[PDB]
DNA sequence: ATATCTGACACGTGCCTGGAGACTAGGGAGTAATCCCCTTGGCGGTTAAAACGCGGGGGACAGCGCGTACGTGCGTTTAAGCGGTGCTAGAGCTGTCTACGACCAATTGAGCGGCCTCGGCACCG
DNA sequence: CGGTGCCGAGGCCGCTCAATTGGTCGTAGACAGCTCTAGCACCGCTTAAACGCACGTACGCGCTGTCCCCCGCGTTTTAACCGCCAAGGGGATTACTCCCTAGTCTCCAGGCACGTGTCAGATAT
C-alpha cells in the first residue's frame, strides 16, 4: 500500500467537471505535484511551530503557512475556504 | 502622498556608485521605485504574516529575517 | 459515527493526511484535527482550480483526455499557478 | 554608513505595511536591518545591471537593462 | 575518446529551434559542450553520492530526482 | 520526443561517472530522465541567451552571451 | 542559557592563530553562520535517513550529507577529517 | 571518564551538538554518537579554513582585529567558500 | 462517411488495515495580570542633502558600408535504435540478534554572568 | 604641542544544569542468505542524421556625428536628524485550568487490486 489521491481527484473533478476523463499519467503527475505542495505545507507549518517556540500544530498555523505560500486572490479565497471548512467541522456535529 | 517619491535621485546615484556603475542615465529612478516597491511588497507581506501569526501587533527583526530566508536571501547576525 | 472528512463534507481523506503529518512531527508535533481539516480543504480547493484550468485547456483543445502539455500551457497561462509550481514540468 | 534617509524609508515602510494591516508598529532596529538588506539587494541588482550594460557595449543604463536582469535572475516581476 | 564530441551540431540546432531562437552562429557547440559538461558534473556527483550512500552500486531515478531537488530544479512524476 | 541521440548520451554519462567510480551501472530510466532534465535546462539557458542577444540588438548568438548569462543567473562557471 | 560556540572558535583559532584577536560582532556573525550550516547539515541528513526509508542517523550519513554540500578539494579533505576523527574515537579508549 | 570530544581530542562540544540534532529527529531519529563526532570534526575543519582565510585578510591588512569586510573580501577571494555561503553578508 | 480495433478507460467485487469513538490523562497552551521598554506623536533647529538652473558635453544611437561565418542542399558515410541473447549480479526480499540509544542518578565542572586593567587613538584643549 | 580613557579581552571567580555512565532494555538495522530482472557486452543492421563540400549570403563590426541628457556645480531650501520628551500599550512574562491529542480497541468499510465491456485514436473501403 503506497497511497495516492487519484480517486479523490476523480471525485472532486466529477464535482466540478462531471463529464471529463483524465489520462493515467496525467493523474499520476497531479498526484506527485499535490504530494509536493502537501509536504511543503507540512514542513513550513513545522518550521512555524518551532518559530513560536511551541510544539503543537493547529489550523491557525496551516493558515499562516498557506497564506505565506500563496499569492493574493488565491491566498484570500484559500483562507476563506479553510476557515469555512474549519467552522463547518467544529460548530457542527 | 508622494510616498514612493521619497527615494531621492541622489540617493540612487550614490547607490549605483557604491554599486559599481558610474553613468546612470535618467529614466530609472521611476523604475528603481517600481522594483523596490515590488520587492518590499513581497518581503513585507511575508513579514506581516509571520508577525500576526504570533498573535502580535508589531514587527520584529526575527520576522524580517525569517522572510528573507523564505526568499532564499538569508542575512546574518540576529537569529539565523 | 461519521468520517471526519465525510462529516465536514470534504473529499480528501483527513485521516491519511493526519498520518502523513504525523510522519514529520519532530517528536512533539500534535495534530490539531482542525489543522488536518484546513489542510485537506486547502488541497481540495487549489487542486480544483488547477483541474479547472487544465480541463479548459482540454476542452478548448477538443480532447476528453488529459496530457502533460495541457497542464504545461495551463500553468504557462496563469501567473499564480506558475508561481506555485517552481518545478520543471515533465514534458 | 547607509545611503537612504531613514525617515523617508519609515514613511514608505509604513505605507506598504498599511495596505496589509492598520496601526501596526515596528521595532526600529528591524526597519534598520530591512533598509540595510534592501539597499544591499538593490546594490547587487545594479551590479548585474552594469555587467549586462557593459555586455551591451554601452556604459549608460536603460530600463531595458533592469527588465532583462530581473528576467534573467528569475524574479520575473 | 571524443566523448564530449558526441553532442552533434544538428542536435543543438534542432534544440535551439525548439528553444525559440533561430540563428545560432557557430562558436557555441563547443560552449554548449562545456556548460552541459559542468551541469552534468554537478548533478551526477550529487546522484552518485546519493547512490553509494545507499551502499548500492547502480544509479536509480529517485537518485537523480533527489539531486535535481537539491539544485532547486525539481522535476515531477517519479518520487517527489 | 527528445532531441539528443540516446547512445551518445550514454557514452558521455558513463565517462563522467567514470572519473568518480569505476564499473558503476545506471537504471536506464534514470539516464532517460537525466537527459530529459539537462536538455530542458539547456533549453532554458538558450531562451535567456536569446533574450540577452535581442537586448544586444543582434539576432545571432556569441559565447559572450552564454558567459554573461551564466554569470547573471549565478552559476558562475 | 542560549548556546554559542564563540569559546570553541576562540580555542581552535588559538590552535591555528594563537596571536590573533577577534571583534565581538565578528564572532557573533561567525556563530550565526556556523549555526546555519549546522542546521543545513542536520536537516539534510534527516532527509537522507528518510530517503533510505530508515529512522536512525549515523556518521556514514553525516558523511553523505557533507559530501553533498561541499565542493571538490574541500569535500575530500572534510571527508578525510571526519573519517579520521571517527576512527580516533572508535578504535580508541 | 573523558568528555567524548576531549576523548577523540576534538574541540567542539559533542554533547551540545548531539542535543541540537535531537531537536530535529522527526520523532524517531537516533543519534549515532559517531555521527555527532563526524559533524563536530566537519564544523571544526571547515571553520578552521574560514578563519585561516579571514586571518590572512587581516594580517595582509595589518590589523589584529576582525571585521565584516575582512571575511567579505575573504569569501570574495575563494570560490568554494563563496559557494558554501549563498547568503548576503551583513556589511 | 464510419465501423472498427486496440488499449485503456470507467463500473463491480471480495479482502483487507486504516479510520471513528471512549476515555483516560496528562500536558501544552489559552488566559489574566503586570510592567515596563520602545514606539509612536510632536516641535524647532539645522545643515547637509535635494531640487533647480545652467553650462556642457559625450556616447549612443539608431541612420550608412560592408563579405564571409551560417542556413540549404544534396551528397556520402555510418553509427545507432532495433532485434534479440545472455545473463548475472546487484537489487529486491526476510530471521536475528545484537550492538546501540533512552534514563536518572551524581556531579560537576565546564560553561554562563560580573569586572578589570590593557590598550587605542586623538586632538581638544 | 600634546599622551591618553570608553570599549572590547582574557582571566577569573561564583553559580548551576547538561554531559557521563550503567545497566537496562528493548529494538533498528546489519547481515546472512536467498531468488530473482534490467545493464552490459555482443553481435550486424536501415536510415537518418552527421560531416562535408559547396553555395550563398548580411549582420555585427566600422561609419554619422551631435546634442541633448546627464554630470558637475553653485543656489536655495527644506526636511532628516538630533534632541528631547512621554507614554502607554503591547511584548513579555508568569501562574492556572482544561480541553484536546493519542492509545488501545472495535470494527468495518471504503480503498485496492482485480476484472471487464466500450468506445477514442486510428485505417481503409
PDB file of C-alpha atoms in Angstrom, chain A residues 8-92:
ATOM      1  CA  UNK A   8     -10.280  11.903  -4.671  1.00  0.00           C
ATOM      2  CA  UNK A   9      -9.055  13.926  -7.641  1.00  0.00           C
ATOM      3  CA  UNK A  10     -11.583  11.961  -9.681  1.00  0.00           C
ATOM      4  CA  UNK A  11     -14.345  12.701  -7.184  1.00  0.00           C
ATOM      5  CA  UNK A  12     -13.762  16.445  -6.915  1.00  0.00           C
ATOM      6  CA  UNK A  13     -13.333  16.670 -10.686  1.00  0.00           C
ATOM      7  CA  UNK A  14     -16.710  14.984 -11.018  1.00  0.00           C
ATOM      8  CA  UNK A  15     -17.946  17.561  -8.518  1.00  0.00           C
ATOM      9  CA  UNK A  16     -16.824  20.277 -10.949  1.00  0.00           C
ATOM     10  CA  UNK A  17     -16.342  18.528 -14.326  1.00  0.00           C
ATOM     11  CA  UNK A  18     -18.690  15.525 -14.181  1.00  0.00           C
ATOM     12  CA  UNK A  19     -18.190  14.867 -17.894  1.00  0.00           C
ATOM     13  CA  UNK A  20     -14.371  14.900 -18.297  1.00  0.00           C
ATOM     14  CA  UNK A  21     -11.943  11.989 -18.471  1.00  0.00           C
ATOM     15  CA  UNK A  22      -8.279  12.090 -17.481  1.00  0.00           C
ATOM     16  CA  UNK A  23      -5.301  10.064 -18.648  1.00  0.00           C
ATOM     17  CA  UNK A  24      -3.468   7.953 -16.092  1.00  0.00           C
ATOM     18  CA  UNK A  25      -0.050   9.587 -16.478  1.00  0.00           C
ATOM     19  CA  UNK A  26      -1.664  12.991 -16.016  1.00  0.00           C
ATOM     20  CA  UNK A  27      -3.369  11.774 -12.841  1.00  0.00           C
ATOM     21  CA  UNK A  28      -0.058  10.453 -11.547  1.00  0.00           C
ATOM     22  CA  UNK A  29       1.665  13.761 -12.250  1.00  0.00           C
ATOM     23  CA  UNK A  30      -1.163  15.545 -10.452  1.00  0.00           C
ATOM     24  CA  UNK A  31      -0.644  13.209  -7.518  1.00  0.00           C
ATOM     25  CA  UNK A  32       3.104  13.875  -7.454  1.00  0.00           C
ATOM     26  CA  UNK A  33       2.540  17.646  -7.552  1.00  0.00           C
ATOM     27  CA  UNK A  34      -0.081  17.572  -4.820  1.00  0.00           C
ATOM     28  CA  UNK A  35       2.208  15.490  -2.637  1.00  0.00           C
ATOM     29  CA  UNK A  36       4.965  18.043  -3.226  1.00  0.00           C
ATOM     30  CA  UNK A  37       2.815  21.011  -2.228  1.00  0.00           C
ATOM     31  CA  UNK A  38       1.484  18.983   0.686  1.00  0.00           C
ATOM     32  CA  UNK A  39       4.907  18.304   2.115  1.00  0.00           C
ATOM     33  CA  UNK A  40       5.779  21.948   1.526  1.00  0.00           C
ATOM     34  CA  UNK A  41       2.799  22.945   3.666  1.00  0.00           C
ATOM     35  CA  UNK A  42       3.779  20.386   6.280  1.00  0.00           C
ATOM     36  CA  UNK A  43       7.423  21.341   6.605  1.00  0.00           C
ATOM     37  CA  UNK A  44       6.545  25.014   6.626  1.00  0.00           C
ATOM     38  CA  UNK A  45       3.977  24.656   9.395  1.00  0.00           C
ATOM     39  CA  UNK A  46       6.542  22.659  11.346  1.00  0.00           C
ATOM     40  CA  UNK A  47       9.028  25.490  10.893  1.00  0.00           C
ATOM     41  CA  UNK A  48       6.336  27.877  12.107  1.00  0.00           C
ATOM     42  CA  UNK A  49       5.508  25.905  15.245  1.00  0.00           C
ATOM     43  CA  UNK A  50       9.215  25.793  16.005  1.00  0.00           C
ATOM     44  CA  UNK A  51       9.440  29.515  15.312  1.00  0.00           C
ATOM     45  CA  UNK A  52       6.933  30.406  18.005  1.00  0.00           C
ATOM     46  CA  UNK A  53       8.973  28.154  20.315  1.00  0.00           C
ATOM     47  CA  UNK A  54       5.975  25.825  20.518  1.00  0.00           C
ATOM     48  CA  UNK A  55       5.395  22.135  19.860  1.00  0.00           C
ATOM     49  CA  UNK A  56       1.853  21.592  18.574  1.00  0.00           C
ATOM     50  CA  UNK A  57       0.179  22.253  15.232  1.00  0.00           C
ATOM     51  CA  UNK A  58      -3.260  23.820  14.816  1.00  0.00           C
ATOM     52  CA  UNK A  59      -5.368  25.021  11.881  1.00  0.00           C
ATOM     53  CA  UNK A  60      -4.334  28.588  12.649  1.00  0.00           C
ATOM     54  CA  UNK A  61      -0.801  27.594  11.666  1.00  0.00           C
ATOM     55  CA  UNK A  62      -1.680  25.739   8.488  1.00  0.00           C
ATOM     56  CA  UNK A  63      -3.473  29.001   7.756  1.00  0.00           C
ATOM     57  CA  UNK A  64      -0.321  31.010   8.409  1.00  0.00           C
ATOM     58  CA  UNK A  65       1.693  28.713   6.169  1.00  0.00           C
ATOM     59  CA  UNK A  66      -0.710  28.723   3.244  1.00  0.00           C
ATOM     60  CA  UNK A  67      -1.037  32.499   3.447  1.00  0.00           C
ATOM     61  CA  UNK A  68       2.746  32.531   3.253  1.00  0.00           C
ATOM     62  CA  UNK A  69       2.937  30.265   0.206  1.00  0.00           C
ATOM     63  CA  UNK A  70       0.049  31.642  -1.742  1.00  0.00           C
ATOM     64  CA  UNK A  71      -0.302  34.917  -3.662  1.00  0.00           C
ATOM     65  CA  UNK A  72      -3.099  37.431  -3.459  1.00  0.00           C
ATOM     66  CA  UNK A  73      -6.589  36.490  -4.623  1.00  0.00           C
ATOM     67  CA  UNK A  74      -5.758  32.794  -4.389  1.00  0.00           C
ATOM     68  CA  UNK A  75      -4.463  33.346  -0.859  1.00  0.00           C
ATOM     69  CA  UNK A  76      -7.653  35.157   0.139  1.00  0.00           C
ATOM     70  CA  UNK A  77     -10.016  32.546  -1.277  1.00  0.00           C
ATOM     71  CA  UNK A  78      -7.914  29.744   0.184  1.00  0.00           C
ATOM     72  CA  UNK A  79      -8.005  31.267   3.663  1.00  0.00           C
ATOM     73  CA  UNK A  80     -11.754  31.723   3.233  1.00  0.00           C
ATOM     74  CA  UNK A  81     -12.307  28.101   2.243  1.00  0.00           C
ATOM     75  CA  UNK A  82     -10.138  26.833   5.071  1.00  0.00           C
ATOM     76  CA  UNK A  83     -11.883  28.889   7.733  1.00  0.00           C
ATOM     77  CA  UNK A  84     -15.303  27.953   6.369  1.00  0.00           C
ATOM     78  CA  UNK A  85     -14.410  24.263   6.446  1.00  0.00           C
ATOM     79  CA  UNK A  86     -12.971  24.565   9.956  1.00  0.00           C
ATOM     80  CA  UNK A  87     -16.234  26.114  11.110  1.00  0.00           C
ATOM     81  CA  UNK A  88     -18.444  23.612   9.270  1.00  0.00           C
ATOM     82  CA  UNK A  89     -16.452  20.985  11.141  1.00  0.00           C
ATOM     83  CA  UNK A  90     -16.268  22.450  14.633  1.00  0.00           C
ATOM     84  CA  UNK A  91     -19.581  24.284  15.066  1.00  0.00           C
ATOM     85  CA  UNK A  92     -21.374  21.177  13.845  1.00  0.00           C
TER      86      UNK A  92
END
